[PDB]
Design a protein around this ligand. Structure first.
Ligand SMILES: *[C@@H]1O[C@H](CO)[C@@H](O[C@@H]2O[C@H](CO)[C@@H](O[C@@H]3O[C@H](CO)[C@@H](O)[C@H](O[C@H]4O[C@H](CO)[C@@H](O)[C@H](O)[C@@H]4O)[C@@H]3O)[C@H](O)[C@H]2NC(C)=O)[C@H](O)[C@H]1NC(C)=O
Ligand SMILES: *[C@@H]1O[C@H](CO)[C@@H](O[C@@H]2O[C@H](CO)[C@@H](O[C@@H]3O[C@H](CO)[C@@H](O)[C@H](O)[C@@H]3O)[C@H](O)[C@H]2NC(C)=O)[C@H](O)[C@H]1NC(C)=O
Ligand SMILES: *[C@@H]1O[C@H](CO[C@@H]2O[C@@H](C)[C@@H](O)[C@@H](O)[C@@H]2O)[C@@H](O[C@@H]2O[C@H](CO)[C@@H](O)[C@H](O)[C@H]2NC(C)=O)[C@H](O)[C@H]1NC(C)=O
Ligand SMILES: *[C@@H]1O[C@H](CO[C@@H]2O[C@@H](C)[C@@H](O)[C@@H](O)[C@@H]2O)[C@@H](O[C@@H]2O[C@H](CO)[C@@H](O)[C@H](O)[C@H]2NC(C)=O)[C@H](O)[C@H]1NC(C)=O
Ligand SMILES: *[C@@H]1O[C@H](CO)[C@@H](O[C@@H]2O[C@H](CO)[C@@H](O)[C@H](O)[C@H]2NC(C)=O)[C@H](O)[C@H]1NC(C)=O
Ligand SMILES: OC[C@@]1(CC[C@]23C[C@H]4C[C@H](C[C@H](C4)C2)C3)NC[C@H](O)[C@@H](O)[C@@H]1O
Ligand SMILES: [Cl-]
Ligand SMILES: [Cl-]
Ligand SMILES: [Cl-]
Ligand SMILES: [Cl-]
Length: 853
């Protein structure tokens, strides 16, 4: 009865350290590990729920679940309702609820799945129809459903699982008795800790390169325990079990299927993809202007200037100080005149200590009842930057209207172009409130997940505090998401164009409203390497607008780290160099000449690729695609890609192999089966001085590891054969770069074929796709010809000038190159690199044929 294989033992004492006699009193097995693995575990006969009255409906199945024996948790719910909904051929949905009480809820034609049920003990079993593989099997462990403890377990189809943000972790999670805690917490990224966001979704790989996803729509504090059997347990402290299974079968379809439920990523403004520069320490408009002057003088592109707390009067939202920032409005107007945008920090918490009538955000907030309240009905008061603060309740419709007013009124004074929303966990410098927290079951729950500080109140507000929709106990993990939604709506109403919101704290569905940065990362080689897995993870979770503070945030960067960090960072979909108050400068212009050259090249390559990056965001927005994706998403059938997380792809075609260690002049990277062209063979124009010329022009891979030259001034980037990439001429801003002629990079297959596309619009209007205010073009290389295919042509993109076509993998020098049947003014062929470079005078929006032979 206690003869359970060690790796299949499920913990019967997750609540407390337990003696043998207590363990056996619970009706559990006690076998000490020989060296983690639980000593106290469930026998296969431990009491669970019994399935009763299973019935067929027109959507799927309904049943009653009955527990006859209570668990060791208080307030077992002995009668549950099961609903199974076969929603699409790709998406299965099942809920387990209390039929007696409404509980908190987060606000061959054939399906790819089959579902069967275990009667006693109760379990859901989901097979993949095609190969009979078991994806979900909840029979492996008892179902627990108590007022403040849900546990649902399943076998996993392999040792390969990714998701469950936000943690400092490899892309593929360890199944060695790993506890993953989802409780939004302000903490500098460190391993084994709950960080700023919670995404209760995983993607599981199966032998052969199929995959499925599971989403638990639950916003309560929870542990996810992985064991080596392999298996997984969801342990939540409230709500209901609301479970979605996505059948894929391709990993990219899993991600698309998940985003069909939580939302497709928002379309950023084009300028949002340029270079951002920030720090705490730009303590006046004069110093802030000097940053732009210094970047401009050294030929470094800069689209967006930011300010941290510096701009505020006494660290209060919707103010500016009359010392260093007296002429704030004029500074932001000047930035706009020069073709740049402005971003500034906004904190959730609102200063509560000012004299009444002297601070409108608090005075208005108090009048409209916008704030989170405590037991006695008064605003819950914490401590953040301004001192004593109340916290807005972004679940309250009146708070959304108040937020829109405060943003619009401040925007009438200073025309900021977006919002950087920090501290939205929400973060508290004290525990709970100025008045502590009451002694109740929400503040002291029977199961506390493995949160840093061992309490739900640590570095945040009281769990029993009141919000419009529910207690903070249920809503905490949404707080940042609700502010991102509020801020997104505020900016649409204020500016009338696409909003740009960067948020620290996130929940599943965040990407529909805002982007993310990975927070207070150390300026270390370790945190540099760790940023690639984290950026890839947020792309799988539908938050493609993500990056880490380029050169690191905490501590002092070195010159070499900042060169390597700027090289990889130029391939973050969101690229911002941000620096702590206590740190040495790390602006690109503050380094030695050779270091500036390397940094200038990385920024130049990024700006050249912006039309391609923008098109990748269009695909994310319209089809639920990833922008930065791991190799395994593009090559799931090659099991060598599965654990690769120190390389990334942009879309299908661009493979980035960064150096992530000090003292290295080479890097070993994995190259999936196919030809990979070195991007160094494509000509790129820069406004300033670039590094001097130093490698193999093309890598012919069978699926293998390849060592590449990677000197300090180099990052390895390869273009996949069979893809065409649109590029645009240089600029110090996107305002300048968008006016430049465009170029095509055509990577020919062995058979002489390639395909690509360009999406173009005005770069910031709302409702572009619905109004049809865009141009979409496809490029096809075949039989020594390149043509464009006009999917849509409008005023926006009509007069795009194509002036350069670079063809990679051209075997022999051509005797003639034609543009629309006429010999071209000029072309060069390199027999060494096999590159054909062609000057042309064509329009993206007008049919052309370029031919050679
Ligand atoms: C819900 O939130 C509200 C805030 O919105 C919060 O109100 C606070 O109540 C405490 C006391 O319970 C107040 O503290 C007082 O501060 C004044 C000075 O401003 C002092 O005179 C008071 O001192 C008396 O009590 C002390 C006990 O420590 C004695 O040492 C002393 O000798 C006095 O007898 C007292 O410290 C606080 O000012 C308000 N906050 C605000 C901003 O009004 C309320 O308590 C919260 N409810 C719960 C249940 O947490
Ligand atoms: C879903 O997971 C459950 C639990 O892991 C699996 O059910 C278990 O299956 C094993 C192997 O079939 C059972 O052991 C066997 O039982 C038979 C009959 O009692 C016995 O003759 C064999 O010698 C063997 O011991 C085990 O009892 C059973 N557990 C329960 C609680 O039913 C099940 O296989 C999984 N379902 C699928 C489709 O994978
Ligand atoms: C399982 O269902 C039976 C039968 O319930 C009836 O048929 C169902 C399809 C549905 O239409 C119900 O509303 C009906 O009541 C339940 O057994 C019945 O229990 C009720 C109330 O105790 C009683 O009036 C009847 O005599 C019972 N009928 C029979 C034939 O046994 C049973 O309780 C359900 N099980 C659970 C745990 O909910
Ligand atoms: C980050 O560096 C600062 C400053 O370092 C000093 O100045 C630089 C030009 C460089 O040459 C360093 O080697 C210098 O030491 C550090 O701030 C120092 O803090 C200590 C107090 O702990 C103080 O005695 C120094 O004078 C400070 N210097 C200044 C100018 O403030 C800071 O500690 C470094 N941070 C980390 C985490 O290493
Ligand atoms: C912008 O660049 C200027 C010029 O390099 C910097 O001003 C110099 O700063 C050094 C210290 O590094 C001083 O010793 C010099 O007196 C300054 N020179 C001039 C011409 O003013 C300035 O610090 C940079 N500003 C920012 C915000 O980066
Ligand atoms: O707006 C101030 C900061 C940083 C605050 C500090 C964090 C560390 C380093 C430094 C000193 C204190 C401890 C406060 C700055 N808030 C948190 C954000 O994650 C930072 O991007 C932001 O710049
Ligand atoms: Cl013991
Ligand atoms: Cl509720
Ligand atoms: Cl391998
Ligand atoms: Cl249309």
């Amino acid at each position: 009865q206690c003869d359970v294989p060690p790796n299949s033992r499920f913990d019967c004492a997750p609540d407390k350290a337990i003696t043998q006699e207590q363990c056996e009193a619970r009706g559990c097995c006690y076998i000490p590990a020989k060296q983690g693995q639980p000593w106290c575990f469930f026998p296969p006969s431990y009491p669970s729920y019994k399935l009763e009255n299973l019935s067929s409906s027109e959507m799927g199945y309904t049943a009653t679940l009955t527990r006859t024996t209570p668990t060791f948790f208080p307030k077992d719910i002995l009668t549950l309702r099961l609903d199974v909904m076969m929603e699409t051929e790709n998406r299965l949905h099942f809920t387990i609820k209390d039929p007696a009480n409404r509980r908190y809820e987060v606000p061959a034609p054939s399906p790819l799945y089959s579902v069967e049920f275990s009667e006693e003990p109760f379990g859901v079993i989901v097979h993949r129809q095609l190969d009979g593989r078991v994806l979900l099997n909840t029979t492996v462990a008892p179902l627990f459903f108590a007022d403040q403890f849900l546990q649902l377990s399943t076998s996993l189809p392999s040792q390969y699982i990714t998701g469950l943000a936000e943690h400092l972790s490899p892309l593929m999670l360890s199944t060695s008795w790993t506890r993953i805690t989802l409780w939004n917490r302000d903490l500098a990224p460190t391993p084994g800790a709950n960080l700023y966001g919670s995404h209760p979704f995983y993607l599981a790989l199966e032998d052969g390169g199929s995959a499925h996803g599971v989403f638990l729509l639950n916003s309560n504090a929870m542990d996810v325990v992985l064991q080596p059997s392999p298996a997984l347990s969801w342990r939540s402290t409230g709500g209901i079990l609301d479970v979605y299974i996505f059948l894929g079968p391709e990993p990219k379809s899993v991600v698309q299927q998940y985003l069909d439920v939580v939302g497709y990523p928002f379309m950023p403004p084009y300028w949002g993809l340029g270079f951002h520069l920030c720090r705490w320490g730009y303590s006046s408009t004069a110093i802030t202007r000097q940053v732009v002057e210094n970047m401009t003088r050294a030929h470094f592109p800069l689209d967006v200037q930011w300010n941290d707390l510096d701009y505020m009067d006494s660290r209060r939202d919707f103010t500016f100080n009359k010392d260093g920032f007296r002429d704030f409005p004029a500074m932001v107007q000047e930035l706009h005149q020069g073709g740049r945008r402005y971003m500034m920090i906004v904190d959730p918490a609102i200063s509560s200590s000012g004299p009444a009538g002297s601070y409108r955000p608090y005075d208005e907030g108090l009048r409209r009842g916008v704030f989170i309240t405590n037991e006695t009905g008064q605003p819950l008061i914490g401590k953040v930057w301004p001192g004593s603060t109340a916290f807005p309740d972004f679940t309250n419709p009146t708070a959304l209207a108040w937020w829109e007013d405060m943003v619009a009124e401040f925007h009438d004074q200073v025309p900021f172009d977006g919002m950087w929303i920090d501290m939205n966990e929400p973060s508290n410098f004290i525990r709970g409130s100025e008045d502590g927290c009451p002694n109740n079951e929400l503040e002291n729950p029977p199961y506390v997940p493995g949160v840093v500080g061992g309490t739900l109140q640590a570095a945040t507000i009281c769990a029993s505090s009141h919000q419009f929709l529910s207690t903070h106990y249920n809503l905490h993990n949404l707080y940042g998401l609700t502010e991102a939604i509020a801020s997104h709506r505020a900016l649409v109403k204020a500016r009338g164009t696409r909003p740009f919101v960067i948020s620290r704290s996130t929940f599943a569905g965040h990407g529909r409203y805002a982007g993310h940065w990975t927070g207070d990362v150390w300026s270390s080689w370790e945190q540099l390497a760790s940023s690639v897995p984290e950026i890839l993870q947020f792309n799988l979770l539908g938050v493609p607008l993500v990056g880490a503070d380029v050169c690191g945030f905490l501590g002092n960067t070195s010159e070499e780290l900042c060169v390597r960090w700027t090289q990889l960072g130029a391939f973050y979909p969101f690229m911002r160099n941000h620096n702590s108050l206590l740190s040495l400068p790390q602006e690109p212009y503050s380094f030695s000449e050779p270091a500036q050259q390397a940094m200038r090249k990385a920024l130049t390559l990024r700006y050249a690729l912006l039309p391609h990056l923008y098109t990748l965001f269009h695909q994310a927005h319209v089809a639920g695609e990833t922008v930065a994706r791991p190799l395994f998403l593009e090559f799931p059938k090659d099991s060598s890609t599965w654990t690769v997380d120190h390389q990334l792809l942009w879309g299908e075609a661009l493979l980035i192999t960064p150096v992530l260690q000090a003292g290295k002049a080479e890097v070993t990277g994995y190259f999936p089966l196919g030809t990979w062209y070195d991007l160094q063979t494509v000509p790129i124009e820069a406004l300033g001085s670039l590094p001097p010329p130093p490698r193999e022009p093309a890598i012919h891979s069978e699926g293998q590891w390849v060592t590449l030259p990677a000197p300090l001034d180099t990052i390895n980037v390869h273009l996949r054969a069979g893809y065409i990439i649109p590029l645009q001429g240089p600029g110090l801003t996107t305002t300048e770069s968008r006016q430049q002629p465009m170029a095509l990079a055509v990577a020919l297959t062995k058979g002489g074929e390639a395909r690509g596309e360009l999406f173009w619009d005005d770069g910031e209007s709302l409702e572009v796709l619905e109004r049809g205010a865009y141009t979409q073009v496809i490029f096809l290389a075949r039989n020594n010809t390149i043509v464009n295919e006009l999917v849509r042509v409008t005023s926006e993109g009509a007069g795009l000038q194509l002036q350069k076509v670079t063809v990679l993998g051209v075997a022999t020098a051509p005797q003639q190159v034609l543009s629309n049947g006429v010999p071209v003014s000029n072309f060069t062929y390199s027999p060494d690199t096999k590159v054909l470079d062609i000057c042309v005078s064509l329009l993206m929006g007008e049919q052309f044929l370029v031919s050679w032979c």
